[model samples]
Target chain A: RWQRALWFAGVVFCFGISAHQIAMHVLDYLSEPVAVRIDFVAQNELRIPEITVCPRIFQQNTIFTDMVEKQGIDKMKFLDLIDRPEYDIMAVWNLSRIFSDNVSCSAHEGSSIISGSYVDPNMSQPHLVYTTSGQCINIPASRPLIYRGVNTFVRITDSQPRNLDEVRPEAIQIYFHEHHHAHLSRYLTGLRGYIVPIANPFAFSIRFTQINYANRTDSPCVDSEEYAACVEDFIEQRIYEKAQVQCRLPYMRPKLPLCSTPTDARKIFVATDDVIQNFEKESSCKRKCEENLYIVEFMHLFERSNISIDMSVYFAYNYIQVATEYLTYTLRGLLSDIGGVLGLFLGICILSVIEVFEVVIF
Target chain B: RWQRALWFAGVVFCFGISAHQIAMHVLDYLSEPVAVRIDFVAQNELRIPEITVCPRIFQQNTIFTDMVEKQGIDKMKFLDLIDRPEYDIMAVWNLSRIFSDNVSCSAHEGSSIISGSYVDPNMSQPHLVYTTSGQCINIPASRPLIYRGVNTFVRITDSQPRNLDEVRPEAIQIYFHEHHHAHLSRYLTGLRGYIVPIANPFAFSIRFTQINYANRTDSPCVDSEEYAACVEDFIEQRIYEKAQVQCRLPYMRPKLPLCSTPTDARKIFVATDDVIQNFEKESSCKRKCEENLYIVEFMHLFERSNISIDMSVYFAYNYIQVATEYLTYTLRGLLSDIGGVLGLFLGICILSVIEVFEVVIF
Candidate 1:
């Protein structure tokens, strides 16, 4: 058994060695922090000659070029095109700081569409991201004000690029993200409707692949059927967060123990009985890792879409290991270096690729 | 204290309810596995056509518009520039199913660049991916094979893209992955040079911030300075997989025990001891997740560059939770169904949300 253990140790050590070397490489990646540079700034006038038009124009040009390339003077063929935006036609551009606050929604779509003034809770900060029609749209009520010199003129769509080739990389990313969000929203809505049963399956599935592809890190191909998973995951996360927030009420009402993991842990439970005891001991009551859950979920959603969430070169998988380890080590350092050892053991993850790859190879 | 306990219990129940709801949503998500069918085959083949005339022609119109929309463009940005044909591309269309023999490095870098051929053990399929760069220019080893009306060809090169923009999405990603590998290999080759300081300073300081955006579901962006990290993580994954293959690994692994509070917990050392033992006892060790340590350095370096990583989502956190729950639930299911416990938790989550949303305007 010891020999067997040694063999196992040897193999693991070898992998650990290589992993360490590779990890070292990751550590060296940035060698410096990535800078968030100011590409351009808007004015106090709430406008800047609509120079932000670059992204808008560029995006439109992408549409034009695509049309030019495919249409080829054939308007008839173009007429055959549907009335909706082609997901492959997703045009990404920077809406960096664009918001028109308290603008009442036009009644065209329904009964009096009007947005209320920022209320308490939401009013303190002007950044409001609301999901309407499956699109994740952000109204940067205050973000633009933070930048220098706004209000150069009266323009609703004030921030955008001017030239097609002049689009900033960030803008493109923003557009891609929005499209991904939009398509996903539509798909989910439809699925909700279908599972709930909606009439128009086309709209629901319109950007289905786009959302799926975005989640998978690929362009959602046309005619392919894949629902928007990242969005679904995102929504699920929101629901969970909400649920957790709601979970708070009952314990106080009934005066009971906080249910965490089961005794043997044969089955999962809530926070555990011990948590409530601790909760009472605290002068002020607040849960641990309230936000951590969402942040982690965000990363997973991005990863699923194949999008690199963190600008860091190291993949999310590595960062998590390093981050958790760093935290663990820091916490444990108070006691000893062995905390890292705890992390090492705790991180005993068995990846699927090894098996999959081996089978695919030999 | 009794009142407080009741309040805490109620709150805990709500949280449980929320978690349960989220779990149910996850089940819906899981019941439907997502399919990402990229036009990689067509896109890859289309790229082959353009490479035939590169430097040859960098200013040509879109090279490969494989997808109806073209997310591929974004995908390539991550890959290395195809400056030379010797390094960048790997055409794996239909080749994944073929069985090509193995060969080794035979020639020099000057003429007839490649030594050629090897068997990938994962799939055990034969392929003709092995070819030389020098000879590719004027030689004839790697060529097109005739197979029943389908012309499948395989070639490689380090021909880099003129600009980052010119890079095709998939190609760039593939390129970057290779570039990372090559860069690391180069670093390994010159590890001796880095032993001494290039510029000695008394002390250098770095600051980093990990942003939790996208509802914290996405992974935080690592600072750009941490570019080394991405490469390192990629390489670590490679090494980890390789080790797993060589050793013949298994599926199950130890889940780090959850901690509601440290008072009732076993020492980490004890946990470590257990992991070491349990790891050995497990019969099969198929999947091996090799922890890449370079991420720590990458984050640090990025911090130094005035760039911080985005700690939006971390899969390690997710995996740990899932693994713990998976094992715990499976173990406990023998005795009973967790439906009631889950139900109570779910109830708490719902009540909390309902109460929050129930506020009426006076």
Candidate 2:
């Protein structure tokens, strides 16, 4: 009887310890821990980024001069006139007309040329996009195709200078951004603002590298309801801002009520105020789950006045470096680990476990 | 006896399967599989990199003019004269003298100024390092200290114009390389050769990022004896080349026998031939075990002639991004996994295994 009791106690203790360890191992496996594998992938065919060129001097000087000389408006009171609600600033400051008349852009891919003014019947042409600053000539990504070892050029010629303040140097503000993101404010975080001087044939040799974050669903935020909600809210807000057609604060002020459109002045004013209040109330935002970040390296800029005053942009290298993240601990690996752990503890393989269940049922 | 035999068979089968599964698990763990974790660390205090500036036109024009006018050497025969064995090229081509006479550099740290000519008694000064190209003014990493948000400046001024052929455009070839490895050939792979136009005040705003590969002992080369030997041979050769005081090929060619020292001409020629033969015999070389790659972003180059023609180098942003690799599957993690597996398979914990041994011994 004592021998039997000792055997039973040993069995109970051993089983108890096995159960605890097995439970811990199973729990750890279920948690799904992840590892990172970083790799650099070289590409032969590179995707050209959306290039936007905005003139430093936002306002057209010709329109301002006409207002001062022809309209009998005092030069000194130009700011006051624009500020007054009676004056229609939008009517005088026609950005589309100013951009078309002054700035001319052309993109070159080897022997092929895609002009902004002249529509290529086969190829896509550049677009005139409007940002908060003014109208900018945007060379869409679809227009130009790039390959390794080939030069893709975008030329911007500001034929006419249009700034009342000549003390500041006349320059072209160039930005390299993503497609479908035309808003200048959206890219303020990673703004690639290159203020290139005009009146010289400037060639900017650029090399780009891309970094991608993947498998972001494994984030700790996904495990927590409140944290997941916060991340979702942040992402939704970003999407809303990205799809916005017009500038946020342009129609908010009473003085600039007619800047966007006079018809929706009252409605926009209320909307702007609500947005401001909401922004103040909820100021929390986290990093994105997944992101494709493009880092542009301005390798060299050659300027010579002997050539035409055309601002050219081209890639320095043929190969595009792409850095991507991979999961080291995969789902298959976890399953194998769990199977091994169960077979070790219970003295039964997966097949044997199934066989025992079958025998019990039968 | 039949019942006993059946029970024995079942016990043997169960124990055999358990032993097999446990063996597999133990073997996998013992293999020492690794996982990777990547992290970006933002540094507050950044270490300044070594900057070297080599003038495009290497030869001093004043010496060339003196040779032509005073020495009664024909203008077209200057190249021939230098090539001649009897004529001492090093006597006339004094790179140290030319570098001091033409170039003047100064470094600025907020309010403090470390002049090249006027030595700051308290601070470390810049050194003139000789490369295969010629003499280059090297702003050693030890001299300047950089911090986040603070501007560090290095100004290079070519007071006197050199070189006989002026049509190609006088420019400064700037390089950013490691301090210990001063050879121009070493950094040819990632050469930041900015041919900056001279006679214009060029301000190059630079931002740098460092990527490090760690735990390189896990490489396949380390596991195989032959592969390890190959890797070690490659590393030793690189170290040998790095320690070499002079250029290899300069003394090899018969025409350039007097380029280096004439005293050891025959010995150097024989050594160069042996090096060439060895290089041909063993052309195999692999990647380094560990690497610290510095990628420089030339953000902007603002040129204006109104200001002094001082080539100024400054940081655009204060924060330095350092990307590092980490081992995810650590030794502690492996130990925990092994303990869990043992407990799960045999129904025996670490303490239980020791207790069983103790009982058996007693």
Candidate 3:
């Protein structure tokens, strides 16, 4: 009877333990998952190109042509071939300089004037500049350029449109020249490649031809003629659209040369000075050309009016989009818990009895 | 009595916590979870368009006419402005260089194979004589040539197929003309906006209709009327394909003029004569008036044989696989560890006065 009583105590204890185990398991599996959701809509308009090329013009003081012709270099004496001098960098500099220099009219202008130098001594350059002497721009070189497009700051947000004034000045300060701060802009914008400075969706329409042409010239593009021709045509179109017409050539910067290159400028001054003098005299009255120079319609070849982007997040339970009883599988939890407790009690009791016998044998 | 004391101590500790909680829960049971398996796979392919349109062919002698019409540029005029004039850019000892002077093609005595200067230095004239100084190459002022394409280095790389040697001496010299070295080539391989330089896993092909329909006017693209007719037919096919064969004309580069402004080269005689003469002569060879000129292949549109790039990295455990463990009741672990301890002690200790006091406080 005493033995039986001991057995009964174990069974009772085991029962309690099992009930607790079941309760723990049921609570675990039946509960809802933890998460959060956010929903948003973005416009389809792309201001990237407009933003990308504008500061280029403002900073360079030349159309893409001069950039191409001179390889957009600020100075190129034979000495430059070996001992390239590093200039004192400015706080703000150019962004598209890499693609704008060399190879001719349609490339990026690789240099920028200092605030104290030629273009506008009083007005600090509006964009960022690079300033380190060697290896100035600290971006991941292995990464592709356009891939840089899916950058952090600009890409992180709704990628909403911004404007020249709207940009945090710091945003234009990351990039640097031989000694400029082009990257200051990067710091300002954080990780977003480059912010869009204007509104109106800043979309540059895609021309079917350009869609198939030299679009990859500055990229890690291959050495192929047909491909090069297409890209060449595409860049030319962009230059014409941005520089010649929209920019209103002559009046863009009164002090700056209006021709495509210094050679053209020299010819204009030495050979066609009279015609220019007369043309200026006449237009100076109506102010038509000067006014037109600053007034550019953002619309270009294949631009779109606008588009939209959407985002959303929901919790797991509702996310699965279904509802039922949490208690359904709870029964199994109770059984397992009970079994675990029962097993524990039995093992303990047996071990205690064996301890008693071992002591007696010793 | 000692046995009873042991049993009592065990029950008092275990039952006190378990029973108290059970009583409280009897009121909480009306609440609770619902959950399942999700099995699938996703391919990693990203189609971004910004990487495409960067490199373009830009610099050269021709204007947009060459771009839109023949896919090239050539030397043009000198006294271009309404009030144009001549300048002495040529230099001294060659003071009255005859070649620097200009005249009509019919009058300039069309041909000469040059070894040195003048038809006869013994005579008065020096250099190739430009018999006249007025009226040079005529190009529309409204056409913006440079804007025809925003080209890159690939454009300069011998869109001419130079075997490294053919590059003009002037071409090499420009590098020294106020040159700058800012090439941190912002290699951004993009998408729909610009095409790639070569074939890829990113192939997004187009129909043939889009080809010549918008091909530049001067290009081997069919003549305006013929192009319009073909476009009409292509649109019809697109209609069947998309909406077909009948989009009309006036949409191609012909009607577009390709760029925004006109103003062309001002060094007509110095830049044009020899080039114009030679280009025409070569094509005139077979007595075949038009045969050597335009025969383009659309088949060459997009093609890449093959390329390779492989990738992967290994990692650790089933982040969240094991389930059935939570606060369902979370009373399980305590129950097992406690019950086993209590049972072991039951076979040994009789409750002490302090133990009873602790149990009472518990």
Candidate 4:
């Protein structure tokens, strides 16, 4: 009688412990631990990034000097001219006159000249976009056109006067960025300004690669409710400085009393409407899942009196370094592990289970 | 009696399975299966690479022109001059006279002039090394002095004639590599020559990073016998193109009859002794465990009549992208796993084993 009780106790303890271990293993498998594998992939061609260049001196020296001299206004009081209702900033600040009379450009696979703000061929024209700083020119991201041996070169020559009455030969700010992001915005993405002086002819090259992150299956943000909560938190805490163009555009268009004056509203719309429109297309609160990084080198190439700039952009190597995330434990492997555990602990093989099932059915 | 016999059979089956499981778990633990974890470490300072420049036109234009006019030698027969026993090639072919009379240089933290084959400060001097191609100037790899904001700039100006009678302005080849490696050898490391025309003043920048691979614990090469076999295979198959300098130097010095002529042996030793000596220091067969990669961008910066060159070598970004390998399955984790398996299968807890030991002692 005592031996029977002891045997029953031992069997009960073993069954409970086996159930605990099996439950733990199932839970661990459900957690889905991940492993990362890093390797380099060789590429024959690479996609070019968007290039934006902003001139420091936007207004022509002749126009600014002529305005100040004709109006008999002090240079310090130039700010008051914008407050006048009839004053038009565009008349004196034409974006087309920023470059010299003969502005020429050569690009990959083709060459074209810019005559009085119009490119010779419409296909090779760069977009004249406006930012908060002033007017700028942007070359859009295109297909992979540069091969291993061939590099994509963009050259621009502006032989404008080095020194002027109102403006001197200052530096031009250049930005390299993704097509989807704002070029010179501080809040949306971290911006680093690379400036080149126009006193000398300069050249630079860009070498870049890409990195990608996988979407984790075990993340809490995968749930809709959790993601929504995160978005709300990002908005409430001002973690994401989203563009107010969506809300401000409607109020400005309707001539709402929110704006103090008609001139103020007009000036605001004129100065930033293009920038606001571009910003409206990009609206997101989370970090990017994938990104491209660029390394740039700049130098003075020529000692000519005229101002010229050359840009050579290509991959430094023929390979792309890639890191990938993968699940360390799989469902199939988990099933096999459970079966092995059961067979080792209780002599319960697959055949034995089938035999027990047959006996029960009979 | 039948019930007791069935109970004993069940106990026997459970004990046998438990013993099998415990043995398997212990053996699995001893096998030590490893997992790899990869991550990146950011770096603040990066070491600069060695820079080598070789002029395409090694022989002076005046010397060649004068020799051809005075000696009345055919242009094609210039090759025979090297075979003449009495002729001296060094008198006509001077490495110092290759550059113009007024060669100037500016480097990081300071500037100096190169007057008659000598730098102003001995510390700033570059080693004049000879390669198989021709004589070359090499700037050795130094300590990390370039910060995030400041760049190391090197400038060289040569105002020699653009078009000479014997040689016109062709190009100069530049190489960037590690200090331990040969500059222009084809057999040791893959050499890519970047050539820039001497007709225009050019500038280039070097942005670099490092990649390190960990020594794998599970590699067969870890054993001495396996490693020796691999080395033997590499040598027998001519896989590693080692320098023959070590074997050839002794024979040449001893005036061995293996060489056809004394003149031939002397010329060979004079032309390649320096290159061979430098190459002899670098003897290895396998791939490097760690390596630094450089990305270079070149452009024509100036349009001056005189030839000039500028080099800006620096890091593109502040952070270093490092990937590290680590083991995930530790010995402690394996021990815990084994203990859990034993507890699940045989109900053998640590305290229960100790209690049984106490009982045995009493």
Q: Write the per-residue lDDT of candidate 2 for residues B46-140, one digit (tens) a residue.
A: 55556676544323333344444555655433333444455554443342133454455655543111111222233334565543333446666
lDDT of 1: 0.22
Question: Across residues A101-162, which tens digit of lDDT does each residue of candidate 3 receive?
Answer: 21111111111100110111111112312221111123221111111111111111123332
Sort by TM-score, top down from the best:
2, 4, 3, 1
Per-residue lDDT over A110-214 for candidate 4, one digit per residue giving the tens place of the 0 to 100 score: 110000011222223356665433445666655554332222345555555455454553456667766544423211221254766665555665655565555
For model 4, the stretches where C-alpha displacement exceeds 4 angstroms are A1-31, A38-46, A56-125, A141-156, A159-169, A180-192, A200-209, A218-288, A295-305, A308-321, A336-360, B1-50, B56-134, B138-174, B179-290, B294-362
Best by DockQ: 2
Clashes of each: 160, 5, 136, 9
TM-score of chain B of 2: 0.60
| Candidate 2: fraction of native contacts reproduced | 0.13
| Least accurate 10 contiguous residues by lDDT in model 2 chain A | A183-192
* Candidate 2 vs 4: which has more TM-score: 2
- Deviation from native of the Cα of residue A360 in model 4, angstroms: 4.4
The interface root-mean-square deviations, each candidate in sequence, come to: 30.4, 11.1, 18.6, 13.5
User: Each prediction's DockQ?
Assistant: 0.01, 0.09, 0.02, 0.06
* Per-residue C-alpha lDDT of model 4 across residues B202-226, encoded as one tens digit per residue: 5666555455544544421133333
What TM-score quantifies how close candidate 2 is to the native fold?
Answer: 0.54
Query: What are the per-residue Cα lDDT tens digits for candidate 3 across B70-107?
Result: 42223232122212223222211122121113211110
